[PDB]
Ligand binder design. Structure first.
Ligand code: MET
Length: 529
């Protein structure tokens, strides 16, 4: 029994925030939310990666001091995530003094167990990705302007040769112990094919890792290696330590950090239950990170879910090349909950998704408006629900027991998808049941039963309300604002809107009064063809 701990990756602050970071954090936010809906202590963590050469030089380009720059951008991030209506507990910055204490404390652990030694790194490097790459992983390409140069195959960004005396981590010694972990825990990297990638890599062989860099190279914009001011710590070790730092910070209601604890157990968050990340940063989390943690004798995480990169109208995203995709703007256009749904629904973690205003409307009209929207407006109209209450149900037909089974079985299958995690599958799961409820309703024809057979209408309405309820509960994390509006319409008491107990069918007693119906309001609004 522990605080469920879920992360988004801390984002480089070299440019403004955009869909990549928003999507990543939404997943994190959703996973966190669901576990809270369960009624569990949760700790969600997003943040910014502010040190290193990439950011140091991005500051230099705009021609302002990095101290000013990083605080400026971090602000654009805090603003945007605040606009997206997330429920992240704390927002972490690698410039934070408590974080340094941790980073240094972690360093010394690695040093005291003798897994750090002074060496050299002579090889390729991407500043834009802050990644060490072998000659096999680089190719010919084009300079930021004219000239021929070498680029990364992974990312297409320029690589420079580096020949520095660095401090070296014995990553090569943790190959065998990594492969046991990949096996021992064969659902610890999601999705499965990304797990096969990681194993295949570690199987080939692992070099040692440069965990320090010549102070000059970095423009002194990093964390000093303990005992040697000539060096600074690899921006990635710095960043990967964010998870441990955040696990150790007591946090006030205003959201400001108020204290760094000595030991990770004191807050019961570490090790992270889930690390949400993107495909592009897999090796750091799936190879380096566990190797570090093993070295330092800390526990390893439970799950790492890597996702893909987005597009718009089948063309990659770029502010400069004619195809932008501003989430705060599209959220203001179509609705914040609606946009989150689309992003979570349209593409699963094994896929590089495709937004378009066409499909956004298709799914908004088809699913949000027509499936779910009509269902809540039906079972709560004056027309069908003449007493504005939860009716007491008569005897159940087999076709009733049929639907009830779905509704009963739904929580458990959604629990699994949410836990994998596979948020797409979980949404579909729910909607299958919503579709099933709209069939049952069309078939029972309650509009007609209000005059023919009120004793029967009681059993239909009840099942429909309880269906809509349980489905809405399990969509809570996806549609946080709209689920509340739904629950209000239904008149579901606040105690019943959360908690594992209210997954069970029949948790709201009959006689429960519905919410006051406002005439002007709809739940979802259709858009043009
Ligand atoms: C601690 S995970 C770091 C992620 C990295 N800063 C990025 O934005 O890709």
């Amino acid at each position: 029994e522990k605080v469920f701990f879920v992360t988004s990756p801390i984002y480089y602050v070299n440019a403004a925030p955009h869909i990549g970071h928003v999507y990543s954090t939404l997943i994190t936010d959703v996973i966190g939310r669901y576990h809270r809906v369960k009624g569990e202590r949760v700790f969600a963590l997003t943040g910014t990666d502010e040190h290193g050469q990439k950011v140091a030089e991005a500051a230099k380009q705009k021609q302002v001091s990095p101290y000013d720059f990083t605080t400026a951008v971090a602000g654009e991030f805090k603003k945007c995530f605040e606009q997206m209506d997330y429920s992240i507990d704390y927002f972490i910055r690698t410039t934070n003094e408590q974080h340094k204490a941790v980073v240094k404390e972690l360093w010394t652990k690695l040093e005291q167990k003798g897994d750090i030694y002074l060496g050299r790194y002579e090889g390729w490097y991407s500043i834009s990705d802050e990644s060490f790459l072998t000659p096999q992983n680089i190719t010919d390409g084009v300079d930021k302007d004219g000239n021929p140069c070498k680029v990364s195959l992974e990312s297409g960004h320029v690589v420079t040769w580096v020949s520095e005396e660095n401090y070296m981590f014995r990553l090569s010694a943790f190959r065998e112990r990594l492969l046991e972990w990949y096996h021992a825990n064969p659902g610890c990297i999601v999705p499965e094919f990304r797990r096969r990638e990681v194993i295949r890599a570690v199987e080939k062989g692992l070099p040692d890792l440069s965990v320090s860099r010549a102070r000059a190279t970095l423009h002194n914009w990093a964390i000093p290696v303990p005992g040697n001011p000539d060096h600074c710590v690899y921006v990635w070790l710095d960043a990967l330590t964010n998870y441990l730092t955040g696990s150790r910070l007591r946090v006030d209601e205003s959201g400001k950090e108020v204290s760094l604890v000595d030991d990770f157990n004191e807050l019961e968050r570490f090790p992270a239950d889930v690390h949400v990340i993107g495909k592009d940063i897999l090796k750091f989390h799936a190879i380096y990170w566990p190797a570090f943690l093993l070295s330092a004798g800390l526990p390893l995480p439970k799950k790492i879910v890597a996702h893909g990169w987005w597009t718009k109208d089948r063309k990659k995203i770029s502010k400069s090349l004619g195809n932008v995709f501003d989430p705060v703007e599209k959220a203001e256009e179509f609705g914040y909950d609606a946009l989150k749904y689309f992003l979570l629904r349209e593409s699963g973690f094994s896929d590089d998704g495709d937004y378009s205003d066409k499909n956004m409307i298709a799914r908004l009209n088809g699913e949000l408006a027509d499936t779910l929207g009509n269902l809540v407006m039906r079972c709560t109209s004056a027309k069908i629900n003449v007493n504005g209450e939860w009716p007491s149900p008569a005897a159940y037909t087999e076709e009733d027991e049929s639907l009830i089974q779905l509704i009963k079985d739904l929580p458990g299958t959604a629990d699994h998808y949410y836990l994998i995690p596979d948020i797409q599958k979980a949404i579909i799961a729910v909607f299958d049941v919503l579709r099933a409820i709209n069939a049952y309703v069309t078939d029972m024809a309650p509009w007609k039963l209000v005059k023919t057979d009120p004793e029967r209408l009681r059993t239909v309405l009840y099942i429909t309300l309880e269906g809509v309820r349980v489905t809405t509960l399990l969509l809570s994390p996806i549609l946080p604002r709209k689920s509340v509006v739904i629950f209000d319409m239904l008149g579901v008491p606040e105690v019943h809107r959360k908690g594992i107990e209210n997954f069970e069918f029949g948790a709201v007693p009959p006689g429960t009064r519905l919410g006051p119906a406002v005439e002007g309001e709809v739940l979802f609004s259709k858009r043009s063809t």
